[PDB]
Amino acid sequence: ASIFRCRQCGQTISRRDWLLPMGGDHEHVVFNPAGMIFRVWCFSLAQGLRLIGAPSGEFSWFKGYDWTIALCGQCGSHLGWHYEGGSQPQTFFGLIKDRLAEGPA
Template sequence: LILCRACGHELALGTDIRSVPSRLALSSRNDTLLGGRRVNVQLFENPHGHRFEVITFRKADVTQHWPSDKRFSWFPGFSWTVATCPRCNTHL
């Protein structure tokens, strides 16, 4: 179970984690979740110099804030959008 750190809202199940490696990642590591499931954590940097650790999911309960966009994606072939927790609006 993946929870929002700010409010505890259930965002996704561990079975929803989907490994999507990106050649644009600054680094990548495998972590182990509770229960022994392995997850690929990748580090990215946006044009403003902000760094983000990213885990990819097949689906998640999040609020999307504008239509998804393929430009500037860290995952070629995929689109992105800002996502927040639907309960507390914390940036995810």
């Protein structure tokens, strides 16, 4: 259990090796303005995503970061967000834990 794939289609997304403890934890439980709760895992790196639109700072869960919606590049499932425009690090991924499947390389 070291690779993360899209739960809907099996697209390769990320690795346990690429987890990032942002503010001391890789897990952040957050809500959007529509009151939806997400258990977000922070990754330094991800692949197989498609980033939609241009970055926004509105309602960012991470101070100093703008977000873009990250879809599965294969099936279009909403897997989380790319964060940019910040510092240490400049960029990272917040992926919704329950939309990933963990398994062998």
